[PDB]
Amino acid sequence: LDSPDRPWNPPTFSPALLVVTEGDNATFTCSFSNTSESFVLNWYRMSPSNQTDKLAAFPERFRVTQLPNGRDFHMSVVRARRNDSGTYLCGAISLAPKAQIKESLRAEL
Amino acid sequence: QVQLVESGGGVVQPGRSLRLDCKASGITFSNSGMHWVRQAPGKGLEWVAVIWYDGSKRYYADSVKGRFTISRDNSKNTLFLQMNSLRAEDTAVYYCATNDDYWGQGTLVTVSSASTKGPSVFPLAPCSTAALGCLVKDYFPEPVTVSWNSGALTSGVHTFPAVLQSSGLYSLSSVVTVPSSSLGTKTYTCNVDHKPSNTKVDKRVESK
Amino acid sequence: STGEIVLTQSPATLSLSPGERATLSCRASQSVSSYLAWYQQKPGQAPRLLIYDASNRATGIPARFSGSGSGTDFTLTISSLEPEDFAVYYCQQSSNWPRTFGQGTKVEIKRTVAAPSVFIFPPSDEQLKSGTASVVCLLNNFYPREAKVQWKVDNALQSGNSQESVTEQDSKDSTYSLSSTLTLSKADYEKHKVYACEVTHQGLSSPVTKSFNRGE
Ligand SMILES: *[C@@H]1O[C@H](CO[C@@H]2O[C@@H](C)[C@@H](O)[C@@H](O)[C@@H]2O)[C@@H](O[C@@H]2O[C@H](CO)[C@@H](O)[C@H](O)[C@H]2NC(C)=O)[C@H](O)[C@H]1NC(C)=O
């Protein structure tokens, strides 16, 4: 490659659009196939102008829980306000000095 | 908790060979491209070689191409540098490092025909304030350490970097400045340690 | 086909006080895109990554470090120098093989000019029982780093028979010290009387000489 390091795949964020009515819980699945144990997973929100807001993070209204399968995580907003409409995504960041970040594709709430 | 540890350093005669190891822990080694970087005493950093996480590609600096070979064993987490046809100017600290910048702490390789030898410690006798010290002469290889009064005297101490003499042996001075009035009341002794030769010398320094 | 990308850092030495702004430059002999990293090295320690790909801070690097540039011109900025920041800085390009470093910029504590205190030491009697004589000239606690030492033996300027050595910047008074060692065989040592060390430095309005006569 150009890079002497092993390439890795970005996490996937599902479903590509989640529709839930007010007061309820909504839940995305961030599926990240790690290769190291040295990463963190972030849950972001894009405003209409593409500005980022970090909601939650694993390890630590907005919750992130790590499934026992080793692969998946669930991002869950509890009691969903409608000023919560819009755009949420996940990204993994490596912990090495030369940090690398891979972002998931984009979903709509 | 991530750790890179180089081993295999030491003394090697010119024209001969030496192999370095770098053991990685705390990372999935087989994801990381790996580098060797070297630094000659008092000089700048010099890139040496790289190997893909894969082993599929290897590149080398002009100064070592063909004499050195980089390799890896992804099933034992170790990186190797085989060094052949070594010359005096290959003397350096050798670091391993991952491509994402974790660094080992380095190991010293000394290319020389000299054999191990402890220092002779000579006094630098004092002649307001006074200066005195010890000449730590004719040892091999680096490094030595010097303290004063078993570590109780530190203020005013200058231990100079060694110089490589045209004979192949190292030489170094350590000095301290003290009150002239202390010369008849205080005792001042050098503590010179040279591990390669198991040398531990204490030299009292006094007015002549 | 393959070229060596030369990295030229300037200045060689930046002399500054804590809290001031530091600006370090790296120029590449040919374009490197944004594949430019900056490292810090303190004496006796492995280098440490600060900035990669021209402008990203490495994990845990404080916000006072920032990088900028592209192509051939790059800058490392330390917005306010902390006392931990006086060190040597290297740039490194990762655009092509072979990888190359710059030759380094030293960030040193700026300080008022201070003249050296000069001391000379004849050879010990113990050393002369062996075959050799070392004469040591000490320049203690001066600033700036540049100092000239000339050995004279019966007023003959010496050449090729001394080696000198300088300490790292002192952490308490920010000065440098230097020792010059002149070596001769016992036989040539005993062929002469007056051994002199002449020191030239910005803090000395005229050269200073320390001397002894062999015999006392
Ligand atoms: C992939 O990651 C899982 C989970 O782990 C990380 O643990 C820390 C690094 C934390 O800071 C976060 O990055 C992640 O939560 C690994 O599985 C774990 O394996 C250890 C081994 O004993 C076990 O203690 C944990 O309970 C496991 N956790 C889960 C959720 O399974 C897994 O090993 C990683 N896979 C690879 C190939 O490295």
Residue numbers in the entry:
A (entry chain G): 25 to 84, 94 to 142
B (entry chain H): 1 to 127, 134 to 214
C (entry chain L): -2 to 213
Authors' account:
The PD-1/nivolumab-Fab complex protein was subsequently prepared for crystal screening and the complex structure of PD-1/nivolumab-Fab was solved at a resolution of 2.4 Å. The overall structure revealed that nivolumab utilizes both heavy chain (VH) and light chain (VL) to interact with PD-1 with a buried surface of 1932.5 Å2. The interaction with PD-1 involved all three CDR loops in the nivolumab VH region, and CDR2 and CDR1 loops in VL provided partial interactions, and LCDR3 does not have any contact. The binding of nivolumab to PD-1 covered residues in the N-loop, as well as the FG and BC loops of the IgV domain. Structural analysis revealed that the N-loop of PD-1 contributes the majority of hydrogen bonds (10 out of 16) within the nivolumab and PD-1 interface. Specifically, amino acids of the N-loop (L25, S27, P28, D29 and R30) formed 10 hydrogen bonds with those in HCDR1 (S30, N31 and G33) and HCDR2 (W52, Y53 and K57) of nivolumab. The FG loop of PD-1 also formed five hydrogen bonds with HCDR3 (D100 and D101) and fragment regions around LCDR2 (Y49 and T56). Notably, N58 of PD-1, the only glycosylation site near the interface of PD-1-nivolumab-Fab complex, is glycosylated with three glycan rings in the unambiguous electron density. However, the N-glycans do not interact with nivolumab. The detailed analysis of the buried surface on PD-1 reveals that the overlapped binding area of nivolumab and PD-L1 is mainly located on the FG loop. These results indicated that the blockade mechanism of nivolumab is that the VL of nivolumab provides steric clash to abrogate the binding of PD-L1 to PD-1.
